């Protein structure tokens, strides 16, 4: 059966029964139906004393058309930890609603490793993404409103960094002209829309410690520049307070469950190129102070997701993960070995060794951070016994690392027990200092070169003029000590999406940079980044319907 | 104290207790925290063929700056009905979010006649306005997308009637250029945004009987024309199913309570000028089958809200009000007598008697449909013992109508027991058949002329060339036997907001028309209409905020 | 010069919702009735609605046909109200220092054109504005 049929057949615990297994009384839950609740601000404030358990990070290899099943391991690992007598919680992101309607939606995991209800996670879960769309739309409205009524701050309509948002796959709103149709309508200007998860408001959501911090951060956001090129903040257009109020309920984390009854938090959903690509700091912190283990993931592979989960999320927060799982599939490694996706059935151990190069770098990159590592191999029936054996051989001989076959997609908890046994071991064993990729009081350009030349394999970096001027501006305006959020393709350690494996001696060209003062990092653009996806020739939407019984078809 | 102080001081019943009072079990309840639940679709379906109770329409005189407390009468009336033993439910409209950040939000009712909780009703509530936005915003996406990939339908970018929506007072988006930025972004068009509330999705949602009816109605909406002027519907772009899927949870009415723990339905919130101004048909229909008495209101006075509530809602759906309550305050009638806002404190001899003519035409107007009326006069501590005594005389002699004093604002339910006894006596008395203003099988022109002459007090109607043309369009194409939705000022029976009281002779100039084929009415435009309102210079947003202890300021 | 004024500092505080001066070209071009201009970000300036008329619609053409001489033409152009400020005060061509440059652009042109009829008699062809939004006569000078 399909992931959806597996989810539909499940008999969910009432969330109060999920909540108990962490210490959460029913009094502390705001139900959304019978199988979802938010955890009330006051209960989460109440946890500032309590000690924190083990944090487990689940990153992966440079993605492939073939799939690697990162999310599936997060849920299976969490299930398995529960099974082997460890009290464990999963931290995950809410997906955008808008892509459900272009291409289809998808499970929170896959097969017998899922977070449910599936249908509600995909659409309007608890209304988080609506609250962010509403917070963002108000600061948009209030910006063009300030300019309409005598433009007191002297906002330069050509220097407004703030864009608008909607959770739809609408290529029409990428670049607009607005405040047209005359005097009563306001001062014409260029503007556009990004998809709601690309909003800096979404970054701040996911990094905020509490409602105090959400407002302090929101008010640092630089929305525009004056004609004389001085900064303008959401605090200048008096937006912070109103936005914080539209996020009051949103900012509570959502408790939900796996197919096997175990607790799972889903909270936040930012990009992993123009933002750090992790779930809300409230979620993982809430996990650490209620469980023995907290399993979370980072968007994309460990060249992008893990670096940011350490250099942005872990650095701001004080958090330090116990251990890191790096997910690989035999199919994925062979694609990084040159095999085209049709030819993936046939044994090719030559292609498997070639693409190990990709895995070999990620392990060596994650270890550079003084963090223990185990390799999760997500099994596939077409995989020969000798392919699995030569990967284990390669991992032991070259990287001195354990390669644990997991079959949790098919067998649930059970398939990930070996991996849970091995994570617990990394956690209990020798704890070293958490190092970072750069010192904070280096030049931004030196933070960029340090990521490109130590982790991507790159010879050098090049800063084009557009960006050189702005980096010179950013460093003069005192944003110099800020972290670096490398916005590039995920499909390669290089900026060329087609260079697979582990390319050395390439050139990383920075085209442009953006400032996210809310989140507290510098966005560094190294390719063409999508912030508003389009719909295909035949959108999933054309076939999304209720049948007779009012079931949803064509969504999965 | 303030409405919000009274609201906050209350201890609310767990929602399943409020539910019990209408025979709804906790199984049928989709909770949104403790104090709100949605009634389940399968539970609403099992009520088909179960017999209807009495239906009470609350309307008012012509709106004034003084205020009338229509929505206070409704919550009063429903609580009082429960005090005196009738099992009663109030239905209301959810308020738009965007206006909260312009002017403040309001109590749903007010004083001791409130539905609660007040913060959530004024903000995201159960994400229904969010669902409609999302649905509206997918329809816009799909239209642009269809043009992008081939434009098989031959849609004319100069002749798309469909606009976009956001739930924000955003003046910047009234007139837009979209699909700019080059080839990959598509075909430059002119576009605009209305507020979410102005959508035909909204008016369709508030009129659909079930999900099957929703889908059929969406799909009849005309969204553009081809270059050769053939009309193109939401069915032609295969939106309807996915719009419905996004609107599934939302079409379930939201169960809330009064400060007295009596059940309250809030669902829907369309405009009362370019729509029918009523709460959802699903809500009032569910109410009727769970309750003896079911109290619902329509926006503006009985010249509009009541008229539309009968000629659109009852007419489409099969419903007949058992009795009508026309709300009136001394302060409003005096204002109709020529008295400015400023001079309302002192007793006024004649103001009341010449302003009464406004109520004199409302009572006559409602009766013209075959409906028993009672005048609810919402008391104020300025009102003398002569002013209230005078109003009753005029009601006794000039009409044959009872004028009952309502102190439900200050006293609570007890101050509308009197009004309750009279509504009972009328509902269980002589029940004449329901007339309508116009016949169905007539020229749309005769339907306008009908309304204006029989109710508005008008001498004739003008049809400008723009409108005359489009009507001829609607008439040949088959939309000739459709109801009419008079978009027009609400402060006057005439088209001139200044002419208070009961003016005769005036002319009703129809400048433009609009087709809502989904809602199945022709919008008829006389006054200037504003589908996207604009924030003030110092909008409420600026002082909206949280305290030290995390309470919301600035919103009331 | 007006958009260039707006672009460098908007010293006159011109409101781009309140520009009455449009553009011209001598071509029946329906594409240019209603434009948005000054697009493509910072170096291209401040976006505003605008449009084109046909050259004869131009007030410059009205002032050319009612000028006595080059001196008169420069004063007349001087007085043209081309926009309003945000505080609703009138802005002229003299405020934007356009008058002298426009005059040298029109100097040779303000000499009337001699030609002849089929029977060799003298004929002056000079100027030609609209007879609806201007007075529809040839030049005074002629």
UniProtKB/Swiss-Prot annotation, chains A, B:
* Known EC number: 6.3.4.3
Could you tell me what this protein is called?
A: Formate--tetrahydrofolate ligase
Q: Does the keyword Acyltransferase apply?
A: no
Q: Which family does it belong to?
A: Belongs to the formate--tetrahydrofolate ligase family.
| Positions with a binding annotation for ATP | 64-71
The protein's matches in PROSITE patterns, at most eight in alphabetical order, are given as: FTHFS_1 (PS00721), FTHFS_2 (PS00722)
Pathway it belongs to?
Answer: One-carbon metabolism; tetrahydrofolate interconversion
Mind listing the UniProt keywords for this protein, alphabetically?
Answer: ATP-binding, Ligase, Nucleotide-binding, One-carbon metabolism
Main enzyme class: ligase
Q: Name one GO molecular function term.
A: formate-tetrahydrofolate ligase activity
Q: Which GO terms describe its biological process?
A: tetrahydrofolate interconversion
Q: Which organism is it from?
A: Methylorubrum extorquens (strain CM4 / NCIMB 13688) (Methylobacterium extorquens)
